[PDB]
């Protein structure tokens, strides 16, 4: 969390739009989707998001899931 993930989050924050407000319903779903894609276009082209950050996130989620599952098993054994 304090290492690779922190650096990647810091790097991604800079490229994020300075201000982004949800568009009104009058524009419609297609225009809203186009606006969101244009605003977040730079994030989409980024390649390391799906190979390192995602991987790191998967590593932190599996660890917590293993912690939760181990506890339940322990409880069952104790019962």
């Amino acid at each position: 969390l304090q290492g690779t993930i922190l650096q990647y989050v810091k790097t991604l924050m800079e490229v994020m739009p300075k201000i982004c407000r949800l568009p009104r319903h009058e524009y419609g779903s297609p225009g809203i989707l186009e606006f969101f894609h244009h605003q977040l276009k730079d994030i989409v082209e980024y390649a390391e998001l799906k190979t390192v950050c995602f991987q790191n996130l998967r590593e932190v989620g599996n660890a917590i899931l293993f912690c939760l599952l181990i506890e339940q098993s322990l409880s069952l054994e104790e019962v």
Binding site: R21, E26, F35, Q39
Partner: protein
Amino acid sequence: QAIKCVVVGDGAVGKTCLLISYTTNAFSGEYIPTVFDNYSANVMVDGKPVNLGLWDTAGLEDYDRLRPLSYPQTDVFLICFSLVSPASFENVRAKWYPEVRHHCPNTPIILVGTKLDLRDDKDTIEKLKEKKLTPITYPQGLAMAKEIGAVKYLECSALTQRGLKTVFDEAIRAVLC
């Protein structure tokens, strides 16, 4: 009490910066193309409360199909052209007025002029002379406004805020009257 004001014009003219400066008295230098932006402002006109619905529109050519989404049920149009770019001066009559008429034939138009502070600045004037172009003058603005039918043509600068409130003060009056 509700007013739907839509602001249109060529790209890189100051529409978004104009709206931001008017609404929050803040100015920025960076240029960022916009697709949809909505700003709400409450003003006292003739002692009558009014809610201003400001709708920014993209000036880039790659959003013509996506522009008319904000046109319906609009009260007043605001066409803005840079004072240090004759390109926008021509593009106004070229596209903006006919498009507004096609999509809105009975709506008032308030012609506006941006970059007033740069009208007399040196570096910009010699840079424009390099291309054999000159800043737009008051008589030309009035001539174009009366040619297209705009009921009022004004000046404003998003930096010095000179003539900033009047722009919107006349538009509310245009619909109220």
